[PDB]
Amino acid sequence: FLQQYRKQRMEEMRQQLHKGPQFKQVFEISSGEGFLDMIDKEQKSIVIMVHIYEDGIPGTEAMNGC
Amino acid sequence: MAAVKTLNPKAEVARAQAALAVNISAARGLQDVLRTNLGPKGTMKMLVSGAGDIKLTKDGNVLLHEMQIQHPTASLIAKVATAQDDITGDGTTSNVLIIGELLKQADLYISEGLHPRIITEGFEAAKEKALQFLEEVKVSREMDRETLIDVARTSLRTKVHAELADVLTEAVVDSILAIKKQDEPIDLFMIEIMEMKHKSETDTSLIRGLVLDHGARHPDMKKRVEDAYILTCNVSLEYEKTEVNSGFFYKSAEEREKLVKAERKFIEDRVKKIIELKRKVCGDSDKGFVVINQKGIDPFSLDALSKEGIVALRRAKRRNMERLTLACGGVALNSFDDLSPDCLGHAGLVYEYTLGEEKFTFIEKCNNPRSVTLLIKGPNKHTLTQIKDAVRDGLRAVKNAIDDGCVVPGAGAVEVAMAEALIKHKPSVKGRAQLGVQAFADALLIIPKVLAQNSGFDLQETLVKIQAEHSESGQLVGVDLNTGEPMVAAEVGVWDNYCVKKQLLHSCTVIATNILLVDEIMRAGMS
Amino acid sequence: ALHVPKAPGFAQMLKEGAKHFSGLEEAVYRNIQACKELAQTTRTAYGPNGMNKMVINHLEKLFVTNDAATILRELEVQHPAAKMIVMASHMQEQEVGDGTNFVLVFAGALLELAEELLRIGLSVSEVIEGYEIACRKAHEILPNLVCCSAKNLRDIDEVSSLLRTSIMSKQYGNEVFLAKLIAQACVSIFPDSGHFNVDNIRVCKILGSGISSSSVLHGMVFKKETEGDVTSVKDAKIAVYSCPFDGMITETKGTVLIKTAEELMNFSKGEENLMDAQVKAIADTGANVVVTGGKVADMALHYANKYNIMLVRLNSKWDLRRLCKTVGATALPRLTPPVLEEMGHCDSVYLSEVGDTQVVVFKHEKEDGAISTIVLRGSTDNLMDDIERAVDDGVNTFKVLTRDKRLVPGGGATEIELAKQITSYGETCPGLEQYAIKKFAEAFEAIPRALAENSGVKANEVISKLYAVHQEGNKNVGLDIEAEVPAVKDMLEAGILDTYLGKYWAIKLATNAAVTVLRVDQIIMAKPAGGPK
Amino acid sequence: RPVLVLSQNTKRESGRKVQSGNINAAKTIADIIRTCLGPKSMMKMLLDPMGGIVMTNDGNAILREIQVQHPAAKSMIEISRTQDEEVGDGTTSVIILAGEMLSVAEHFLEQQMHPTVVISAYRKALDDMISTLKKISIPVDISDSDMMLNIINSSITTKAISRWSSLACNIALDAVKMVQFEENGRKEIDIKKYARVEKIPGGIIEDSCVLRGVMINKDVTHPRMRRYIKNPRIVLLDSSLEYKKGESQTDIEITREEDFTRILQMEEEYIQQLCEDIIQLKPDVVITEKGISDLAQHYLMRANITAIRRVRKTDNNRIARACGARIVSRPEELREDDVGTGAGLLEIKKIGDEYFTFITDCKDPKACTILLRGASKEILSEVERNLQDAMQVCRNVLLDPQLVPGGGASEMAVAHALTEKSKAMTGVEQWPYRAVAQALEVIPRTLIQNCGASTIRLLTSLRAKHTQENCETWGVNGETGTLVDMKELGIWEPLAVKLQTYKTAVETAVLLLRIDDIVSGHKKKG
Amino acid sequence: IILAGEMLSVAEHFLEQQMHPTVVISAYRKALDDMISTLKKISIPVDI
């Protein structure tokens, strides 16, 4: 019954221990020009995931914490 | 306003009496929802999921999980009920009812400026006294078949209607008595619960064997074997590649044919081992040979086995290895290095049943099976799920009654007796914790209240009648759900698990004490 | 003082999109209304005078039929109670194959009368108890109403007469011809062994020549052509291979490692010689037709053409297994010549054109075999689909007859007799359950009422005449369709009969569905969210 | 079109407003958990952004879950974390003390006193605070288990687990004592790695106990394994018991018919040889951090050996410490010293619907598992936090056998001592000296406020009592609001905890008093 | 209001039974006439 995700619970268990110095937050882009000037920088090795959202609508808070 | 709001402007804070009001309102809402579930006369709820799935249910835990609630205190109560269901398997609605009534009674005194700490102290003292009284009142009886049947009734009659509960009582009691070994813990993993969707809900029964949701994959294999030798194996009988990137090289078509022929020799060796063992064991045609493999079997091996009159099943469940070992009586094999008739299981009948696109295999007539299966039958998916939950609760109740050397009278009699004992013990408590003791007793009194209310009778009149009868006679009298008159639960046969009552007391008291001491609820993880 | 706040407790804790219906009026009456509406939608297609309905699903696919199960399947039913009734009807279809509209109508009538009982002061528990008692009484009474049995199943005329009624509700105009076709197809199947397999009957739909040109073929027909040049065999000796008609290769990785010029020169010639030898060995066993489940190699096809071997390629493994059952061969896993036991035989195999469709026909001259095929003609795809549904209903009726041979009168006679007997029984028993028992009996009137409504006559006069005749003593009398005025006639004489098992299972399932719907008291619907399927 | 010296999103604040904002932010941080100090504290519910719920009255747990934008609050949070990491207790006390010292420093900042003078006075005060705490301390005989139990009880009497005080104290003391270790002349405790706390929801808290060994959530690989062994010999491994590819590319080339079968047979023979090398030492249990092949399972079963696979590395280390084994990677190098003899029982039993492996009868185990059973996950998490506090206090006492009176007695004694010493300053630093000395009265004041009694009269009486000669142990009863000698109430705390709290609070005040300009908005500029 | 609701409720049964509403209306009017007659019959006098 490996497909029932027995290891999922313990994965959450040791994912709870984030770090010592707080846990920070998710960065927010102020403007489209800001988006462009933070996106053209850095190197290829850096992987970026970006989330579009609005307040109140379902699903944003859960995956934001994720 | 608040300090947290000053530090985090977009924060939600509930301080001082606001936190108590929020928690008590949430608990009272949950209690109001779950009042109509207690007892066999409780109403049945239908829950529709997002995808449109229909689920008829009456369990407290199932209702809590599939009820659209997004409250913190509700989350804590749901976690407590989840633990209660996980360990004991019963007493989930009673947990929520007792927590809610505890909080309401505590609020009734807190609203007069009383600090919650005094109420918590009274709760702890009352819990200790109630635990002592429960130890005093339990009935230590040798668990024969009649007592187990009575306990299974007291569970399933609440879970399902009358005749279905009557069938399930015999089913679960017989299954537990079949798998139970003297002076050993009961392994509930050995009762495989199978679902079929082709008959009425009362056609569910117990099979003294095993039922597999998969059948033979070769059309030429026999559909029914009278006398069977069971070979439980965990060997990949299909084609497997070399781990070190073998690859083939040839210079002609004939060489390619030779390589193709010789590439399956490794599998054909163990197939020949199986065939030779079968031929040695049963040289006649009376006795059949059944092979159950946890790993797959390629069509070549299937044909080679079927040519010898051997029925083989592939991709069996992992727990089915132990289930077949305990039921048929063989030895599970991870390799055919040295296999002998001593490792072969025995089954007095093996036949395959077909239901639409799904094929089922029955392995019955075992000598003394230590692992049986329950076949759930019904015309609907929601009916199957409801019967599944009822059977789970009944099995847990019977196992708890077997493990515990005692059993507790039901119908709310023990709650009434605990409340009266707590009232009598109240003067012994020093200080204002007597108020907490009284609140705890009144909270314990909720079960007969809810039972009488669900049965349709008057609440206060029925409770006062029960209390007067218990006080004047000293017996353990509970609520009769048909007439409302006092009834002796022990004589009638309304039984409750001692472990369930103890867990209820402990968990409810702990969670109520923790909730009552909360003075602030915060959410400042943003910005 | 201009806004009503949500009540404290569960009302406020409920999620944003969820709904909570509790109590009698908010839940039970609404569920009964939804079931009544569903029964109303399906009602008009009941009986021989039922009307087809064009139903277009979410994929713009058109279904025209009067089959209740098909109409329910292709309707986007959303209400939970209606979903429960629909799945009860589908369960009835799975168990028996006919009576789905009976299940719907009976459940709707039962729930309507349950609502009527609840409005006058009865309780849900008492109504459920009365319904269960009346259902047990009906199941006890039903065996006593059996008028005749099958008494034979290998006969053609008797089986056709028995199956006429089942396929008369659908295709009222022309049921005798369809009855003859299905009777022949079922008699070909069902050997001396008592087992009868529904899957052994195949339906082939070839458009063009009207349904009256349909026929039954003792064998199988495939909608494809032949790979080779041979297109007809008179003494077919099919050899069936599950493997591709090509030289088998290794499973890990092949590599023709050439190290000298001579090996490169000889490799292709050797491979061709091996293929030729294999095909010649196959042909030397007398086999003249080869059926493969895989692709066909060019070299193998050329050598089969050289040796005059007919090649048929079957895509589906189900088709391969069915062909093996029909011809009597064994699906070989390699390209070895077949031994005598695995040597399929057939009377004739040829490539033929029907309308504009090229088909391959495996035909047996003998009146035997394991699989029989019905070739359906017609001028429309939807018409042929409806005819196929009728054929499936007839085959399921034949299967039920094999399981149980008892027959009860049709045409509303059985329902009227059940209603009369249940009312008579309920008059005896005192207590509050007598109202529920009487309502359960009255709910049986919805079948003759539906038949009268669909036939265009006055239902009340028909029901009154039925009660008069049944009180006289004739329990085998139902309404007469072939009459523009309310009239009744003996159903046994007219041979309008339906299976006892169908009635038993339909009544049981309808009662179970109605009781289960009534048991529900609270509805907690989550947010609809997604769930495309 | 704008010239600009700095970036348009760079904001600068300077002057008195910066100091006022910093001190107000520190005071707000103090006010967050002002009411969570003392035996009569109240719980707080924290809603984790990940959806979890934290219910606690511990200062560090409360502060960690709060996201703040004012960076002085960030400094305070870091201070709380530092206090929690260093000693494990005194987390609320350090925050409250830092807030009080920053308030009394703002008092002088209202006047024309430079912050450096206040900082120098604070550092002199801190030195004298350390001296006074060292003076009024008393020694402890660690061999007296009753004294250790009383110390742990005084440590955990202010938490939820205080109801089951004796049970919690015994669990913590036993765990710390059996985890204590010494090797190669080095003495260590290492509570963080060993002494794992495993919580299983359900049951009753009274059933919780510290196991004489290690328990893991694992089951036997094969059903026919033995689930109950009397005196097992445990062998621990890292390398898997499977057939794995080599590091280098090792493509084969097969041209003969029998080479495929030979390759597969050699795979089987290699597995058999590995299993035989394991079997040679005749063990009873084999534990692997990685997978075990089915053929390896069969070969071990042929020798009647119980095999468990995919065990975490930390759990394997804990088992090695408990049963006295040594983890071995290559089975061919397995030696008798590496076989774990000393485990007195191994049993796989079912709890709820899960299987748990118990090695719980080891003689002289150097690692333990604390099995917690309770109402739910949140209750067990709070119990685990309380147990962590208890074990940290126990290890602090073991490392430093000094104690000082609790319940505000030490605070008042140190305040009086520094006030008396300040009479000879005869300078300008005497005022901040006296202010920071008297700021220690916030702990007794907070205790009285949480108790609900009258602050002014009780605190005046406490000060008057402390003005006498032999009264350094006179604190305040936190649950009755009356003055009482703490050598009768028996509430004591480790000297290390008080020293760390005082030092951290004073350094926090010093750090926040040195800031008079805030620049924000600039990019990281990596 | 309750009386009208009940009358329409009991009429719906006949409208669903292939009965034209005019017959129901005629029966309702006859019933109303007889109701008025019966009410006038069972009345009692009162001296003001």
Ligand SMILES: Nc1ncnc2c1ncn2[C@@H]1O[C@H](COP(=O)(O)OP(=O)(O)O)[C@@H](O)[C@H]1O
């Ligand atoms: N036949 C009966 N007569 C009277 N009381 C009953 C009967 N059956 C069960 N009960 C009472 O109902 C309670 C069980 O309620 P139940 O719905 O099972 O709640 P939970 O699922 O939380 O245990 C028991 O405390 C028992 O005393």
Ligand SMILES: Nc1ncnc2c1ncn2[C@@H]1O[C@H](COP(=O)(O)OP(=O)(O)O)[C@@H](O)[C@H]1O
């Ligand atoms: N010639 C006929 N005269 C009267 N009734 C008939 C005749 N033929 C069929 N029926 C009735 O039609 C009913 C079948 O309805 P049908 O449309 O098949 O619904 P279902 O498919 O759900 O069974 C049977 O109960 C039968 O009594």
Ligand SMILES: Nc1ncnc2c1ncn2[C@@H]1O[C@H](COP(=O)(O)OP(=O)(O)O)[C@@H](O)[C@H]1O
């Ligand atoms: N029984 C008691 N009476 C009075 N004061 C007490 C008592 N027990 C503990 N204290 C005081 O409470 C403080 C512990 O409070 P606590 O909630 O643990 O704060 P922290 O988490 O910062 O240590 C100690 O400084 C001690 O002086």
Ligand SMILES: [Mg+2]
């Ligand atoms: Mg229960």
Ligand SMILES: [Mg+2]
């Ligand atoms: Mg029909």
Ligand SMILES: [Mg+2]
């Ligand atoms: Mg502390």
